[PDB]
Structure formats: structure tokens, C-alpha cells
Amino acid sequence: RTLVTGGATPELEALIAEENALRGGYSTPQTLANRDRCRVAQLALLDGPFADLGDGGCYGDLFCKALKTYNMLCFGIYRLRDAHLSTPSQCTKRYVITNPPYEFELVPTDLIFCLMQFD
Amino acid sequence: KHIVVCGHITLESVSNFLKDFLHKDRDDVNVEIVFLHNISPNLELEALFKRHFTQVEFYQGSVLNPHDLARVKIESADACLILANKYCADPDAEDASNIMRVISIKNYHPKIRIITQMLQYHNKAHLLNIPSWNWKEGDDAICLAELKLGFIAQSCLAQGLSTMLANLFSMRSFIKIEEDTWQKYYLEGVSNEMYTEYLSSAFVGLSFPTVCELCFVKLKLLMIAIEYSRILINPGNHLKIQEGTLGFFIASDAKEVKRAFFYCKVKKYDSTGMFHWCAPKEIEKVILTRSEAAMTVLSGHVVVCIFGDVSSALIGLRNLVMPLRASNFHYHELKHIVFVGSIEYLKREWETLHNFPKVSILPGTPLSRADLRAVNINLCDMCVILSANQNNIDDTSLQDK
Amino acid sequence: IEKVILTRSEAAMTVLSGHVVVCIFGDVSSALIGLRNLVMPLRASNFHYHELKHIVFVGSIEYLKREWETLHNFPKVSILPGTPLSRADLRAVNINLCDMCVILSANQNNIDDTSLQDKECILASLNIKSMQFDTTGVNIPIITELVNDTNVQFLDQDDDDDPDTELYLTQPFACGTAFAVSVLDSLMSATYFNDNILTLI
């Protein structure tokens, strides 16, 4: 719930139990650091700084580098259906890879599931 | 120990629940399962019960009868499970029935764990207002509409996340495929599941990214969250992990999960500050036309298609818009949302959406290629197709045509 | 009616103590139940004016407007549109300081469902019992009306609920926090043998 519904905090749960509605508020020293949480994102390893590792680099190497560089958690790979096949084609359908091992190569046209912080 | 399963006892749901709960790859299956229903089972269902002879026992009775509840020995049961008809014509009647089941169970025994489905989100407050209910203790209820709409909304921002999350709960083994296709890679991906277990005490002063990379490079486990009264999704470089924080694990089986413990060495936002909030807006301020959509340049947006009318039920599009208006996003990074469908139906739900910004409505039908070209469906980030009347239509087959 | 219409803010800023609240589950289509006979003994004249009990109403404004034509002549009456299931709404009328709470059911007559009988009344009673204040809602005196006698088992939790047991032996009826119309059937045999209804009732 707290991952997919934006946020399910005890304070919000108590407020919705009390009111069954939502009301606007005002800026405070608190409820402004409340935005500091990770969100879902997709990263393309084509133009970013990690595109160098996208040729044949290790997925675990990419993961540890992203964490130690930006606290940039990544856990999934979005890969084309016929990317593994040597025959080129116009198919753009992409399947999902869940928790790749450390010794996993990278296709230069791969999309990676990721989580990033807030500024 | 034994558990009690009651509610919409239908054979396909029972088969799915048994094949998921009693899967061979679990640790222990010593717990027993007891059923309750007011209708006698059919011959193939006695065949299934005979197949699972020493794990499940059936009984005849009503969950609203205290004599039946004492007969099933609920006071000795570890937890109670409630199944609801996901394909009921009237969602409100099923929700009220499930609420009555919960009330009866809590009345017979105050302290016991109950898990149930929830067709509509607006009755969650009704269920929570029960005096004996305490979700802090472990009384948890799942809302089907909330989870589905959240999955779709998060898939809008990042495609594939819906199945990424949905494949983390189906308890499955690993099956090898040697055909060198996408199937083997997808199956190796889906072989993983979700587990929770307390980490070793050696990780106290370490930072969260440091312990993440350490556990990854050491024993091939990765973190997604930790328990703090709150669950923090990937804290970064400023949180020192406490003792017994119950980190969340992703692995193929609980055996590698156990390895971690045995370690060898103006009003812009909501009053809560959780989501963006704006002043109430009249629907006429967000009604658009074909020419208005043509002159309105839209790119990198979200288009949702809704089919229904006044006679149709309610989906709860507020519960879909809500995760897309979180405070985690900046204001100018928000995704514009437009609506295509019946205005007569959509006025029944607009009153739950006037507090959100960047919302547009285009009356018509989503089968109009002119309308789809007007909303610039070429440049949309994600297109969503729903159907309010998917359940109440007469034909058993030919659904969502 | 506009003179006695009260919204949440003005109801909250006003103070009420030792009052009587009424919860109504009805609409325009629901059958009339009659409330002049309810406010009548409260607005008798044995009481002095200062010791009179204030009465406020929580229910659908349509039903209140339909019933107002026979009720506007009584003093110290207020109307609050809304629903009795809202925790903030119940907090706005200071139930913790309220003398006692009454729950009705306007649409009990026309509903033909064997199940779901008095479900809204049971839910409201559970909610008011589950009320928590700065001290909880179990001590709030309430009376509820029931149309199915078997539903009385759900009104309390620390009770040995049994279906074979009849009505008056139950803990809610013995404590006076529950009531039903089925008790009134004995009045026919009572009045056949005597003349008690003519004066005493």
C-alpha cells in the first residue's frame, strides 16, 4: 500500500478514518520534509552516464555503481522480446526481468527499473 | 494450528487459493484449513477435498450462527479468511455482506486476525469503524479496486511495474527452458518472490546504501524497504539502521532469506502534506471540446478511456488519480490527465476529483478516431482502457468486447 | 427551517450539554415514521423552561424538511443536515457531553431483504461505541430500535450471544440500550383483561 498508493501513513489513515475526506493545508517546517521519499522511475542507458556500461557490463556492477553514486536503487530490467535474437526486426514489445543476477550482461537498448530520491 | 475460510466459496476460487497457499515450495504446511458455506459442495469439489485429504476439512453451516462458529472452534483458530465474489452484479451488497461477516466474527471473538477482500474503497472506513478492529495488531483487509487502480497508475509512470509487482506474490518455483527465447528469461525473473526477516545485529552503524551493497555483493540479496511505526522505501545516506528493523527481502526461497540472520564475520498541498491539493473546481471549467483539445497542445500525458453510463456502477477513478498526485513529484513534472467517456456517468464521480490539478474532461466515446487524434494519443505516455459495466452485462461469455 | 439549520462549524462553536441527539436513516422515498410524538413528552410542561432538554437532529435534510411541517412549534430544536456515520459530525455535536443518543430507521418498512436488516443501525451503534475522546465511547448511553429480534446479539461484544435465547433475557434489552416493536404485542392481551392503557400508558 505504501509503495503503490503514493503513501499510507498512520497519520493519513487516522485522518481519513476521522474525516472520510481530504482538506488542503499550509506550508510548515514539517510536512515539507515529508516529500523526501523514493519514487518509481525508468532509466534509459543510451544517453546517461551509465551508457558506457550498457555494452557488455555487469548488471551487478551497474547496480552497485548506481547505489554508491546516487543512492539510486534499481531492481528490474525491461528488455525487448527479440533483443537476444541475432536477426534484426521492427518488434518493439518488451518483457520484464525480475531481480537479475550479478553476472548479467547488458544490451545497449535496455530499459532498467529504478527508484530515485527527491530534491 | 488451523484457520477458517468462509464467504464466497466457489470452486475455481477454492482451487486457486489451495494451489497458492499449499504450494510445495513453502517451509511448513502443518496448519489445517477449515471451510464454511451454506451450499453443499458438488461432486468434483468432494473430489478435490479427497485429493487434499489430510489438510482441508469441509463443514456445513452459516457464519452468522454462533452455534456454527463454536462448532468450527474459531477461538482456537489462528486466523480467519473471508472470500468475496469479485464478479457480483452489485458490489455494495457483497461489501455489506462481508461487513456483516466481519461483525459476526468479531462479536463471537474479539481478539482474532481476519483477512478479507473489499470491492469498494468507500466502505473501508465503514469496516475500520468496528470497535474490535485494529489494523496495527494485524487485522488487514485488501481492497481489490484500490490495488488494481494503484497498479495501473504506477504502470502509467513506468510500464511493466504492474506485472513486476504482481509476479512477486504468486508462490512459484524455478523452471528451466533451453529454447533460448524470451520465455526462459521471463521465467527466471518470475521465479523470485517476496519475504521478510530480521537482519543480523552486525548492521547497526552502517548506512542503508552500504548495507544494501554489502548484502548484495555478499549473499545476493537486495533491499527494498525497512520497518522504522513507518516503512521507509530506500533511505539514502542519512539514516542509521536500528536494531531489529525487519528489512524486506527479495529471493527465490526463504532458505537464502534465513542466511542474513546467520551472518559470519496559499493552499498548494494537502493538510497532511502527502499529496498536491487545489481549490474546488466546477466541471464546466474542465469540460473540453474537439476544437479545445486540438488547440490544447498535450504531450507526455496520460489518457484514460472509460465506458459506461448512469446505470453502470462506479470504478473509483479518484483512487486511480490519487497515486499520480503525490507530493514526491514536482509540480511541473506532473503528468496531465484527460478523460474520454460518458459525461453523464463521469458527473457521478467528478465530485470526488475537484481537488486535484491538471485534470481535463472530453465528452464522447473512446472509439472515435477523431477524438483520439484530437487528444494527441500519438504523444501520450500511457493509455488506459477501463469498463465500468464489465460485471453486470447479461452474457456470461463475450466479456470486454 | 432555515432558522434551525446548523452547519458543522456553527454546531462545533456552539456548546451543548445534557442534550438529546437523534439519528435518522431516511430520504424522500422512505415512509414517514412520525416525530411529533417523540418530541412531545420531551416538550411537555411538567418541566421548567430552564431544565428543558435541548434536541438536535442528524439525518437527511429532505426527510427533515418533509417532517418539519408538524414540528416547528416546539422550542429548543435544531437541525443538522448530514449522516450519523461521520466521526467528525458526531464530534461536532459533543456526544461525550450528550445526555443520551437515539437511533431510528425510517426505511425499515419497505426493505424486503431477509439479511441486511437494521445493518445501518448496528453500524451506527458500533461506531458510537468505538468513538474515542481525549475517554472512549463504550460509556456513551444510547438506545437503538430494531426490527429483527435476532440482530440484538451484535449490539454488544462482551455478551454470551445465543440464538435460542429470547429477547428480554439478552444483555442489551436487560440494560435498556436496545428496543424493538415486537415487545408491544403483549399489550393486546394486557388491555383485554383490564383498563390500564386508558390511563396509565
PDB file of C-alpha atoms in Angstrom, chain C:
ATOM      1  CA  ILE C   1     -36.391  25.503   8.814  1.00  0.00           C
ATOM      2  CA  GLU C   2     -33.528  27.769   7.696  1.00  0.00           C
ATOM      3  CA  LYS C   3     -33.582  29.357  11.158  1.00  0.00           C
ATOM      4  CA  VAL C   4     -32.780  25.994  12.786  1.00  0.00           C
ATOM      5  CA  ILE C   5     -30.426  24.689  10.088  1.00  0.00           C
ATOM      6  CA  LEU C   6     -26.975  24.291  11.648  1.00  0.00           C
ATOM      7  CA  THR C   7     -23.761  23.581   9.761  1.00  0.00           C
ATOM      8  CA  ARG C   8     -20.679  21.846  11.135  1.00  0.00           C
ATOM      9  CA  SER C   9     -18.722  24.993  12.035  1.00  0.00           C
ATOM     10  CA  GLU C  10     -21.521  26.737  13.935  1.00  0.00           C
ATOM     11  CA  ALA C  11     -22.519  23.458  15.601  1.00  0.00           C
ATOM     12  CA  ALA C  12     -18.920  22.984  16.755  1.00  0.00           C
ATOM     13  CA  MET C  13     -18.543  26.533  18.073  1.00  0.00           C
ATOM     14  CA  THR C  14     -21.869  26.288  19.904  1.00  0.00           C
ATOM     15  CA  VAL C  15     -21.851  24.353  23.181  1.00  0.00           C
ATOM     16  CA  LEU C  16     -24.420  21.686  24.072  1.00  0.00           C
ATOM     17  CA  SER C  17     -24.538  19.737  27.336  1.00  0.00           C
ATOM     18  CA  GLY C  18     -27.137  17.278  28.582  1.00  0.00           C
ATOM     19  CA  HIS C  19     -28.886  17.338  25.203  1.00  0.00           C
ATOM     20  CA  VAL C  20     -30.576  14.639  23.119  1.00  0.00           C
ATOM     21  CA  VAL C  21     -29.376  13.699  19.633  1.00  0.00           C
ATOM     22  CA  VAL C  22     -31.444  11.801  17.067  1.00  0.00           C
ATOM     23  CA  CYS C  23     -30.081   9.790  14.134  1.00  0.00           C
ATOM     24  CA  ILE C  24     -32.398   9.253  11.157  1.00  0.00           C
ATOM     25  CA  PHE C  25     -31.811   6.885   8.225  1.00  0.00           C
ATOM     26  CA  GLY C  26     -34.311   8.063   5.628  1.00  0.00           C
ATOM     27  CA  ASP C  27     -34.860  10.002   2.428  1.00  0.00           C
ATOM     28  CA  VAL C  28     -37.693  11.399   0.317  1.00  0.00           C
ATOM     29  CA  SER C  29     -38.799   7.918  -0.784  1.00  0.00           C
ATOM     30  CA  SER C  30     -38.781   6.490   2.753  1.00  0.00           C
ATOM     31  CA  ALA C  31     -42.058   6.127   4.623  1.00  0.00           C
ATOM     32  CA  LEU C  32     -42.821   8.662   7.337  1.00  0.00           C
ATOM     33  CA  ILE C  33     -42.297   7.495  10.913  1.00  0.00           C
ATOM     34  CA  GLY C  34     -43.609  10.489  12.878  1.00  0.00           C
ATOM     35  CA  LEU C  35     -41.522  12.539  15.301  1.00  0.00           C
ATOM     36  CA  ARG C  36     -44.017  14.944  16.890  1.00  0.00           C
ATOM     37  CA  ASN C  37     -44.965  12.108  19.244  1.00  0.00           C
ATOM     38  CA  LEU C  38     -41.248  11.719  20.025  1.00  0.00           C
ATOM     39  CA  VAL C  39     -40.572  15.387  20.818  1.00  0.00           C
ATOM     40  CA  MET C  40     -43.942  15.566  22.599  1.00  0.00           C
ATOM     41  CA  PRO C  41     -43.138  14.115  26.074  1.00  0.00           C
ATOM     42  CA  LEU C  42     -39.806  15.943  25.983  1.00  0.00           C
ATOM     43  CA  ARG C  43     -41.716  19.142  25.202  1.00  0.00           C
ATOM     44  CA  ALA C  44     -44.323  18.544  27.879  1.00  0.00           C
ATOM     45  CA  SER C  45     -44.883  21.240  30.527  1.00  0.00           C
ATOM     46  CA  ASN C  46     -44.154  19.436  33.801  1.00  0.00           C
ATOM     47  CA  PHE C  47     -40.561  20.574  33.295  1.00  0.00           C
ATOM     48  CA  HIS C  48     -39.499  24.155  33.851  1.00  0.00           C
ATOM     49  CA  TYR C  49     -38.167  26.108  30.883  1.00  0.00           C
ATOM     50  CA  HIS C  50     -34.577  26.198  32.155  1.00  0.00           C
ATOM     51  CA  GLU C  51     -34.420  22.435  32.797  1.00  0.00           C
ATOM     52  CA  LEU C  52     -35.781  21.599  29.333  1.00  0.00           C
ATOM     53  CA  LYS C  53     -33.585  19.237  27.316  1.00  0.00           C
ATOM     54  CA  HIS C  54     -32.171  20.569  24.056  1.00  0.00           C
ATOM     55  CA  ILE C  55     -32.817  18.392  20.997  1.00  0.00           C
ATOM     56  CA  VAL C  56     -30.783  18.249  17.783  1.00  0.00           C
ATOM     57  CA  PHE C  57     -31.329  16.107  14.700  1.00  0.00           C
ATOM     58  CA  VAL C  58     -28.866  14.305  12.428  1.00  0.00           C
ATOM     59  CA  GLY C  59     -30.277  12.963   9.184  1.00  0.00           C
ATOM     60  CA  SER C  60     -31.232  13.683   5.606  1.00  0.00           C
ATOM     61  CA  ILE C  61     -32.378  17.260   5.046  1.00  0.00           C
ATOM     62  CA  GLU C  62     -35.101  16.052   2.666  1.00  0.00           C
ATOM     63  CA  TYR C  63     -36.699  13.855   5.337  1.00  0.00           C
ATOM     64  CA  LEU C  64     -36.297  16.597   7.945  1.00  0.00           C
ATOM     65  CA  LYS C  65     -37.991  19.108   5.626  1.00  0.00           C
ATOM     66  CA  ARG C  66     -40.806  16.643   4.935  1.00  0.00           C
ATOM     67  CA  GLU C  67     -41.354  16.119   8.674  1.00  0.00           C
ATOM     68  CA  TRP C  68     -40.864  19.767   9.716  1.00  0.00           C
ATOM     69  CA  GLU C  69     -44.466  20.790   8.931  1.00  0.00           C
ATOM     70  CA  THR C  70     -45.687  19.227  12.207  1.00  0.00           C
ATOM     71  CA  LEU C  71     -42.700  20.136  14.395  1.00  0.00           C
ATOM     72  CA  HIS C  72     -41.854  23.856  14.015  1.00  0.00           C
ATOM     73  CA  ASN C  73     -43.949  24.875  17.043  1.00  0.00           C
ATOM     74  CA  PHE C  74     -41.621  23.301  19.607  1.00  0.00           C
ATOM     75  CA  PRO C  75     -38.762  25.261  21.211  1.00  0.00           C
ATOM     76  CA  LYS C  76     -35.082  24.356  21.593  1.00  0.00           C
ATOM     77  CA  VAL C  77     -34.962  22.264  18.408  1.00  0.00           C
ATOM     78  CA  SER C  78     -32.036  22.303  15.974  1.00  0.00           C
ATOM     79  CA  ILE C  79     -31.442  20.521  12.665  1.00  0.00           C
ATOM     80  CA  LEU C  80     -28.026  19.406  11.400  1.00  0.00           C
ATOM     81  CA  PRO C  81     -28.001  18.013   7.839  1.00  0.00           C
ATOM     82  CA  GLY C  82     -25.661  15.123   7.154  1.00  0.00           C
ATOM     83  CA  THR C  83     -25.245  11.499   8.172  1.00  0.00           C
ATOM     84  CA  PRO C  84     -24.720   9.938  11.619  1.00  0.00           C
ATOM     85  CA  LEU C  85     -21.859   7.739  10.357  1.00  0.00           C
ATOM     86  CA  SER C  86     -19.361  10.626  10.184  1.00  0.00           C
ATOM     87  CA  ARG C  87     -16.925  10.701  13.105  1.00  0.00           C
ATOM     88  CA  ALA C  88     -16.291  14.433  12.679  1.00  0.00           C
ATOM     89  CA  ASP C  89     -20.039  15.085  12.515  1.00  0.00           C
ATOM     90  CA  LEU C  90     -20.626  13.150  15.742  1.00  0.00           C
ATOM     91  CA  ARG C  91     -17.738  15.026  17.371  1.00  0.00           C
ATOM     92  CA  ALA C  92     -19.260  18.349  16.281  1.00  0.00           C
ATOM     93  CA  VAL C  93     -22.350  17.810  18.475  1.00  0.00           C
ATOM     94  CA  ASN C  94     -20.359  16.793  21.603  1.00  0.00           C
ATOM     95  CA  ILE C  95     -21.720  13.289  22.136  1.00  0.00           C
ATOM     96  CA  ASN C  96     -19.351  12.790  25.081  1.00  0.00           C
ATOM     97  CA  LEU C  97     -21.284  15.569  26.837  1.00  0.00           C
ATOM     98  CA  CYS C  98     -24.627  14.462  25.360  1.00  0.00           C
ATOM     99  CA  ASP C  99     -27.155  13.015  27.792  1.00  0.00           C
ATOM    100  CA  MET C 100     -28.219  10.068  25.623  1.00  0.00           C
ATOM    101  CA  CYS C 101     -28.320   9.171  21.919  1.00  0.00           C
ATOM    102  CA  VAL C 102     -31.286   7.804  19.952  1.00  0.00           C
ATOM    103  CA  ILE C 103     -31.086   5.859  16.675  1.00  0.00           C
ATOM    104  CA  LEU C 104     -34.054   5.297  14.342  1.00  0.00           C
ATOM    105  CA  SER C 105     -34.644   3.582  10.996  1.00  0.00           C
ATOM    106  CA  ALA C 106     -37.087   5.200   8.571  1.00  0.00           C
ATOM    107  CA  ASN C 107     -36.667   2.723   5.689  1.00  0.00           C
ATOM    108  CA  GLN C 108     -37.188  -0.434   7.764  1.00  0.00           C
ATOM    109  CA  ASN C 109     -40.733  -0.982   6.488  1.00  0.00           C
ATOM    110  CA  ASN C 110     -40.136  -1.090   2.724  1.00  0.00           C
ATOM    111  CA  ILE C 111     -36.973  -3.236   2.735  1.00  0.00           C
ATOM    112  CA  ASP C 112     -37.746  -6.874   1.921  1.00  0.00           C
ATOM    113  CA  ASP C 113     -34.247  -8.339   2.321  1.00  0.00           C
ATOM    114  CA  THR C 114     -34.035 -11.136   4.883  1.00  0.00           C
ATOM    115  CA  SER C 115     -30.434 -10.113   5.559  1.00  0.00           C
ATOM    116  CA  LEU C 116     -29.103  -6.545   5.962  1.00  0.00           C
ATOM    117  CA  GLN C 117     -31.946  -5.741   8.374  1.00  0.00           C
ATOM    118  CA  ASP C 118     -31.044  -2.905  10.775  1.00  0.00           C
ATOM    119  CA  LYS C 119     -27.484  -3.009   9.417  1.00  0.00           C
ATOM    120  CA  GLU C 120     -27.133   0.783   9.386  1.00  0.00           C
ATOM    121  CA  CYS C 121     -28.404   0.981  12.977  1.00  0.00           C
ATOM    122  CA  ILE C 122     -25.940  -1.713  14.075  1.00  0.00           C
ATOM    123  CA  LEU C 123     -23.115   0.079  12.254  1.00  0.00           C
ATOM    124  CA  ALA C 124     -24.012   3.407  13.878  1.00  0.00           C
ATOM    125  CA  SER C 125     -24.153   1.803  17.332  1.00  0.00           C
ATOM    126  CA  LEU C 126     -20.771   0.149  16.791  1.00  0.00           C
ATOM    127  CA  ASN C 127     -19.294   3.444  15.572  1.00  0.00           C
ATOM    128  CA  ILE C 128     -20.556   5.430  18.560  1.00  0.00           C
ATOM    129  CA  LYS C 129     -19.241   2.696  20.870  1.00  0.00           C
ATOM    130  CA  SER C 130     -15.904   2.864  19.020  1.00  0.00           C
ATOM    131  CA  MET C 131     -15.759   6.652  19.445  1.00  0.00           C
ATOM    132  CA  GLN C 132     -12.550   7.728  21.180  1.00  0.00           C
ATOM    133  CA  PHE C 133     -12.165  11.038  23.016  1.00  0.00           C
ATOM    134  CA  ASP C 134      -9.355  12.926  24.728  1.00  0.00           C
ATOM    135  CA  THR C 135     -12.456   8.564  27.495  1.00  0.00           C
ATOM    136  CA  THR C 136     -13.948   6.120  24.986  1.00  0.00           C
ATOM    137  CA  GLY C 137     -17.404   5.585  23.535  1.00  0.00           C
ATOM    138  CA  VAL C 138     -18.395   2.435  25.428  1.00  0.00           C
ATOM    139  CA  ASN C 139     -19.808   4.579  28.259  1.00  0.00           C
ATOM    140  CA  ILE C 140     -21.999   6.722  25.972  1.00  0.00           C
ATOM    141  CA  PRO C 141     -25.684   5.986  26.753  1.00  0.00           C
ATOM    142  CA  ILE C 142     -27.508   5.056  23.543  1.00  0.00           C
ATOM    143  CA  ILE C 143     -30.847   3.479  22.649  1.00  0.00           C
ATOM    144  CA  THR C 144     -31.408   1.795  19.290  1.00  0.00           C
ATOM    145  CA  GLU C 145     -34.517   0.461  17.574  1.00  0.00           C
ATOM    146  CA  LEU C 146     -34.558  -2.983  15.977  1.00  0.00           C
ATOM    147  CA  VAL C 147     -36.941  -4.696  13.580  1.00  0.00           C
ATOM    148  CA  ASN C 148     -35.316  -8.161  13.762  1.00  0.00           C
ATOM    149  CA  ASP C 149     -35.018  -9.648  17.241  1.00  0.00           C
ATOM    150  CA  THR C 150     -32.089 -11.909  16.325  1.00  0.00           C
ATOM    151  CA  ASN C 151     -29.935  -8.874  15.458  1.00  0.00           C
ATOM    152  CA  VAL C 152     -29.661  -7.861  19.137  1.00  0.00           C
ATOM    153  CA  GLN C 153     -26.614 -10.126  19.546  1.00  0.00           C
ATOM    154  CA  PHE C 154     -24.438  -7.735  17.517  1.00  0.00           C
ATOM    155  CA  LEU C 155     -25.178  -4.684  19.686  1.00  0.00           C
ATOM    156  CA  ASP C 156     -22.690  -5.765  22.372  1.00  0.00           C
ATOM    157  CA  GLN C 157     -19.378  -7.626  22.394  1.00  0.00           C
ATOM    158  CA  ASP C 158     -18.863  -8.901  25.965  1.00  0.00           C
ATOM    159  CA  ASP C 159     -22.058 -10.954  25.871  1.00  0.00           C
ATOM    160  CA  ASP C 160     -22.806 -14.678  25.671  1.00  0.00           C
ATOM    161  CA  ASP C 161     -24.766 -14.310  22.448  1.00  0.00           C
ATOM    162  CA  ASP C 162     -27.154 -17.218  21.863  1.00  0.00           C
ATOM    163  CA  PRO C 163     -29.883 -17.538  19.208  1.00  0.00           C
ATOM    164  CA  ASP C 164     -32.102 -19.892  21.213  1.00  0.00           C
ATOM    165  CA  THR C 165     -32.408 -17.271  23.957  1.00  0.00           C
ATOM    166  CA  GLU C 166     -35.402 -14.971  23.523  1.00  0.00           C
ATOM    167  CA  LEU C 167     -35.432 -11.174  23.641  1.00  0.00           C
ATOM    168  CA  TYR C 168     -35.788  -9.940  27.218  1.00  0.00           C
ATOM    169  CA  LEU C 169     -33.058 -12.229  28.591  1.00  0.00           C
ATOM    170  CA  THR C 170     -30.427 -10.589  26.372  1.00  0.00           C
ATOM    171  CA  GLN C 171     -27.913  -8.197  27.898  1.00  0.00           C
ATOM    172  CA  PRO C 172     -28.807  -5.194  25.647  1.00  0.00           C
ATOM    173  CA  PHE C 173     -32.525  -5.443  26.431  1.00  0.00           C
ATOM    174  CA  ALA C 174     -31.825  -6.027  30.126  1.00  0.00           C
ATOM    175  CA  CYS C 175     -29.574  -2.955  30.155  1.00  0.00           C
ATOM    176  CA  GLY C 176     -32.118  -0.868  28.246  1.00  0.00           C
ATOM    177  CA  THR C 177     -29.810   0.080  25.368  1.00  0.00           C
ATOM    178  CA  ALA C 178     -31.934  -1.842  22.838  1.00  0.00           C
ATOM    179  CA  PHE C 179     -35.599  -1.820  21.870  1.00  0.00           C
ATOM    180  CA  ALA C 180     -37.904  -3.461  19.344  1.00  0.00           C
ATOM    181  CA  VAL C 181     -41.545  -3.204  18.322  1.00  0.00           C
ATOM    182  CA  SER C 182     -42.140  -6.951  18.797  1.00  0.00           C
ATOM    183  CA  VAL C 183     -42.337  -6.452  22.578  1.00  0.00           C
ATOM    184  CA  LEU C 184     -45.532  -4.408  22.123  1.00  0.00           C
ATOM    185  CA  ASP C 185     -47.623  -7.416  21.021  1.00  0.00           C
ATOM    186  CA  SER C 186     -48.468  -8.280  24.645  1.00  0.00           C
ATOM    187  CA  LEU C 187     -50.420  -5.024  25.038  1.00  0.00           C
ATOM    188  CA  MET C 188     -53.478  -6.539  23.329  1.00  0.00           C
ATOM    189  CA  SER C 189     -53.797  -9.350  25.871  1.00  0.00           C
ATOM    190  CA  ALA C 190     -52.929  -6.833  28.590  1.00  0.00           C
ATOM    191  CA  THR C 191     -55.730  -4.424  27.657  1.00  0.00           C
ATOM    192  CA  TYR C 192     -58.319  -7.143  27.046  1.00  0.00           C
ATOM    193  CA  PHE C 193     -58.316  -8.096  30.739  1.00  0.00           C
ATOM    194  CA  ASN C 194     -58.042  -4.605  32.261  1.00  0.00           C
ATOM    195  CA  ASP C 195     -58.195  -0.843  31.652  1.00  0.00           C
ATOM    196  CA  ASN C 196     -54.521   0.054  32.079  1.00  0.00           C
ATOM    197  CA  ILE C 197     -53.934   1.593  28.649  1.00  0.00           C
ATOM    198  CA  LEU C 198     -56.832   4.038  29.063  1.00  0.00           C
ATOM    199  CA  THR C 199     -54.980   5.971  31.775  1.00  0.00           C
ATOM    200  CA  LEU C 200     -51.525   4.672  32.704  1.00  0.00           C
ATOM    201  CA  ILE C 201     -49.947   4.298  29.266  1.00  0.00           C
TER     202      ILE C 201
END
